[PDB]
Structure formats: structure tokens, C-alpha cells
Amino acid sequence: DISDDFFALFLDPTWVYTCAYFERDDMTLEEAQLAKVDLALDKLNLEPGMTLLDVGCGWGGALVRAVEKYDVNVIGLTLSRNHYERSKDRLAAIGTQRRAEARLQGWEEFEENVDRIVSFEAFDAFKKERYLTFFERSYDILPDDGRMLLHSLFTYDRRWLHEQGIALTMSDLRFLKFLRESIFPGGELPSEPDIVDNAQAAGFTIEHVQLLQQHYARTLDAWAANLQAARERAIAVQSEEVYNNFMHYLTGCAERFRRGLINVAQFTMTK
Ligand SMILES: C[S@@+](CC[C@H](N)C(=O)[O-])C[C@H]1O[C@@H](n2cnc3c(N)ncnc32)[C@H](O)[C@@H]1O
């Protein structure tokens, strides 16, 4: 796979590799990633000592922020060994009396009770045959007053796009094929109904939906600018092919969020 050393060339120190939130226009990338995490965690009404599950925890930035700012116990799940190892190391290096653990484990195998759940851009990696199952499991492990913040990408169909004045081009179809045949996200995104209808069938109320479309455009622009500025080092760590493929993903996805072809949002879900 792609080395952490490559991603380090374009991500900020949190290692967060999902849509940032430019809560103030002059925030740096790091500040906007912490703002995105805090935006989500504030919606969970966390109290010190609660237990927070992060489904699909990446390299651990949100878990570290949850411990540091919110003083919660944390459990992070991932399917990626590289994600797990960095998460494990970062959490162990936090000075805290709380429980802070990362696991190489899917949510399908996790059955422990937790007080709150967060997830950032993992849901699009789930098979559509598991969308309902995921919400059922999340409902079951939460207490009666539990809350989940689902931050997910989602797509729109031709009819909706057309009603909004947007068309999918032959280039867009080529780009979707590029995504499907690569490690990059976006090849088989859920629709908004795939999120909302399954969450509601499992018993959740959708309290709030916050769209972040243009924040993602800006985030992807920042990653691309960072990667081009480090091009020689990126080629050295990987190769020119990989570098160019990443640039194609980052810039192509930025263009598509700007145009409105796809979206990303935080869904506050309550019981
Ligand atoms: C696009 S990354 C998001 C990483 C992190 N949330 C962030 O904001 O940078 C998706 C992560 O979800 C994880 N993931 C995908 N499917 C999963 C599953 N069924 N259970 C647990 N984690 C999963 C991947 O292994 C990866 O760590």
C-alpha cells in the first residue's frame, strides 16, 4: 500500500484525512481539522469520563483530540494496519488516566456498550448490504440517551442534480471509474436516503444535518497544494505514477465538490 511517509508530505500534524472545517476563514489546515473534530464532538454532549467509540479511526487524530480536549475514554476501530499502529502509538503517548485504545477490528465484530459514537468518512467504505446493520448495531450499543455523529460522504443521482442545475459529464464518468479502480474514496457512495432512511428504520432521529461541501473543496485544494510543493519527496517515497494519481484524485475531487456533484455532511443522530 501507500506509505505513511507519503501521506505525511501533505497532511497536517493531526494526520486527519477527511474534510476539514474552516470555522474561521483564516484557519490553517491543522486548525480546521481540529475545528471539524470539535464540531462533531460538541454535538455529542460529552462529559468527562464518558466512553466514545470512533468507527474508522484512521491515524487517530480525532481520538487524540477527544482525550485531550474532552477528557473521555476512547475506543477506535479500523481495518487498516497502518492506521491502527499510528493510532495505538499516539494514544499510548498521551498522558491520561482514561482508557485510550485502538483496535484492528471492524464495527461488525464490536459489541461493547459505549456512551457515544463518532465516525468520519468510514460509512462510504461499507457495503450497501450493511447500511441498515450498521445503524442497528450502533443503536444497540448506545444507552437510551445515546447520540451518534455520522460524518459521511454521499452522492446525488441525475434527476436531483438536474433539478439543481448540474449535469454529469463524460469526464465525470471517467473520473468515477478512476475512483472505483483505485484506493481513493468516492467510487460507490451512498445516497442521502441510504443514510437517513436506514438510520430512521433502526430507531434514530436525525436532529441536524450540516453540509460541508465547500469545506471539502478547500481541504482538497490544500492537500493538492501541499503535495505539489513536496513533489520530489513524494516521488522519492513512492513514484511519479503514484504522485500523479494522487494529484488527479485531489484536484478532481475538489472540482467535483465545488460544482456540487457530491456532498459531505455531519448527521446528528439521537435515540
Ligand atoms: C477514509 S478513513 C477516515 C480516517 C479518519 N476517520 C479521519 O478522519 O482521518 C476510513 C477509516 O475507516 C476504516 N474502516 C473502513 N471500514 C471499517 C469497518 N467495517 N470497521 C471499522 N473501520 C472501518 C478504515 O480502515 C479507515 O481507518
Ligand code: NA
Ligand atoms: Na481528568
